[PDB]
Design a protein around this ligand. Structure first.
Ligand SMILES: [Zn+2]
Ligand SMILES: [Zn+2]
Ligand SMILES: [Zn+2]
Length: 313
């Protein structure tokens, strides 16, 4: 049953209908080349389609069954359900809001979202976020964009977006960080993240995992603190024995980071049999293979084939 309120701006008016879902849109809100002719699927349905196509699913999704994704969405829900989100934890009751269904054609709340996830209804992170966004749309429609509840619903969505992004960067990292087992940061992932010296401007060189490469920036997760930052690629070296010296305020904190990295290297050598340190100041390059080479003096031989286990995660 189609919505009356634009998915983008949350206002009524003349609105286009999606063929696949009940969302509607002002044409003007979509900034189109021209209005659609007939077969039209909205930006949410389009995203979901691209994300759920096996050939073009993310690295994260290729890693994961629908049931494994559902486990991770359960962790995301628990972050969304934090103290102060009470108003959104259960369906809106008609007792308190007798006219709710006159405005809100697709109710949603955190308990429904959680149940849906447990039932394996979501095929990708995009689909989970698209559904959670009904909570904010509905809040704005019914209560108004400047209502205090809208602040809360906005934070719930920003949390969801954050958690979905983390799943997509690396589902194995995400699960490890969620469960916080003993030395969780020292567990190598199935396609292990290269270790780098990473220098954020104004910060000392520090050991990190390189999680992804986007246009000249590296997404680095630092040993010790386990914080993150985009780092310019030319400020990232492959891990080496020789340390790029920086003046630092606390030696003990840097020591704890190096110790953690040492355990990680022991663990990767156990898991894959290899870890190659680089000559000092060797530039990190995207999708770096160096550390996983069987013979680092013979890069054409690549990484060793030992493998055909189903439980890769
Ligand atoms: Zn609009
Ligand atoms: Zn749609
Ligand atoms: Zn990972």
């Amino acid at each position: 049953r189609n919505d009356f309120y634009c998915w983008v701006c949350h206002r009524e008016g003349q609105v286009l209908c999606c063929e696949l879902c009940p969302r509607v849109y002002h044409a003007k809100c979509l900034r189109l080349t021209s209005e659609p002719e007939g077969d039209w699927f909205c930006p949410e349905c389009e995203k979901i389609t691209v994300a759920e196509c096996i050939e073009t699913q993310s690295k994260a999704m290729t890693m994961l069954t629908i049931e494994q994704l559902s486990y991770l969405l359960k962790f995301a829900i628990q972050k969304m359900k934090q103290p102060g989100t009470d108003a959104f934890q259960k369906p809106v009751p008609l007792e308190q809001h007798p006219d709710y269904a006159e405005y809100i054609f697709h109710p949603m709340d955190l308990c429904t979202l959680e149940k849906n996830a447990k039932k394996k209804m979501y095929g990708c992170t995009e689909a989970f976020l698209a559904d959670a966004k009904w909570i904010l749309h509905n809040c704005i429609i019914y209560n108004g964009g400047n209502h205090k509840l809208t602040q809360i619903a906005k934070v719930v969505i920003k949390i969801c977006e954050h958690e979905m992004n983390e799943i997509e960067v690396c589902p194995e990292c995400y699960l490890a960080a969620c469960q916080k087992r003993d030395n969780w940061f020292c567990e190598p992932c199935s396609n292990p993240h290269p270790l780098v010296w990473a220098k954020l401007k104004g910060f000392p060189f520090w050991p990190a995992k390189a999680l992804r490469d986007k246009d000249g920036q590296v997404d680095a997760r630092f040993f010790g603190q386990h914080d993150r930052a985009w780092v310019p690629i030319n400020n990232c070296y492959l891990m080496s024995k020789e340390i790029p010296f920086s003046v630092k305020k606390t030696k003990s904190i840097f020591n704890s980071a190096m110790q953690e990295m040492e355990v990680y290297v022991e663990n990767i050598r156990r898991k894959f049999g290899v870890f190659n340190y680089s000559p000092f100041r060797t530039p990190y390059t995207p999708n770096s293979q160096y550390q996983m080479l069987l013979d680092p003096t013979n890069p054409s031989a690549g990484t060793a084939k030992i493998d055909q286990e189903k439980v890769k995660l």
